Amino acid sequence: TVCEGDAIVLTTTTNASAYVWSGPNGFSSNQQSPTVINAATVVDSGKYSLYVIDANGCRSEDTSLQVVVNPTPTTPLIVSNNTPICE
Amino acid sequence: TVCEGDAIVLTTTTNASAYVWSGPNGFSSNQQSPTVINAATVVDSGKYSLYVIDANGCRSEDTSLQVVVNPTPTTPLIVSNNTPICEGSNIVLSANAGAAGTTYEWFNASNVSVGTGQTLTIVGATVADAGDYYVITTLNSCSSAASSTTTAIVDQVPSTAAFAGNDINLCNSF
């Protein structure tokens, strides 16, 4: 779970002959450590998945990670300004 | 259905050996979750389709999604500016007519609503009603950029009384 504008990092720790990653915004990678989304936005929310190809070419089961990106609040306005006052 | 400038997200939920997506602006993808159109425009309107290739290479039937992008209204103009008024008078500002169905909302200098319609009337206006006004044009849940800012002028009745000097009395002079 990250705030909008922060980075989304999805990497794995196991060894593989190949990795296969897939996600919500067309995210795709084949490396132990995929390119990081440096300034994530709300479209990056969702389910990401990864399965590992071993040394002899076999494909283990699908696992997953859920990513949540919290939207930036809007810029506030100061509306009331009871400013012209005496000490 | 989205407003122009918003994002179009077309993803599926089923598993596949491959996906095939196609759409109106040359849109194409083979992933469960295609790259999102982050700021869609009117050319993105239309019929999008997707069919799924299974594990053994067979192709299921075509299904579809209709996407509608509502255009941004034009930036409104303030045309009439009955602004040079004395306190107690009404301020009358009026926006140019837009597309049929256009909703007009007026905003104060402080960015708060002051009323709706092509013509904004502030009745019994006072000095606090003087200053910046702008117009927002709304259509089909889309809103355009604010109009050029105009200003109301509310004059105060001054406290100074008229006063002439004393009488002039002349001998043989015009």
Side-chain angles (χ1 to χ4, degrees), chain B residues 25-39:
Chain B
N25 199 36
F27 175 76
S28 177
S29 176
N30 60 353
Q31 323 147 59
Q32 186 179 349
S33 178
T35 302
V36 170
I37 302 169
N38 285 332

Side-chain angles (χ1 to χ4, degrees), chain B residues 102-115:
Chain B
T102 300
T103 296
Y104 292 80
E105 187 176 6
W106 289 81
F107 272 179
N108 212 330
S110 61
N111 299 306
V112 301
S113 173
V114 298

Side-chain angles (χ1 to χ4, degrees), chain B residues 109-136:
Chain B
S110 61
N111 299 306
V112 301
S113 173
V114 298
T116 63
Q118 301 196 12
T119 299
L120 172 69
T121 301
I122 300 170
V123 176
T126 187
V127 296
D129 296 309
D132 291 349
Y133 289 89
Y134 60 85
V135 178
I136 305 300

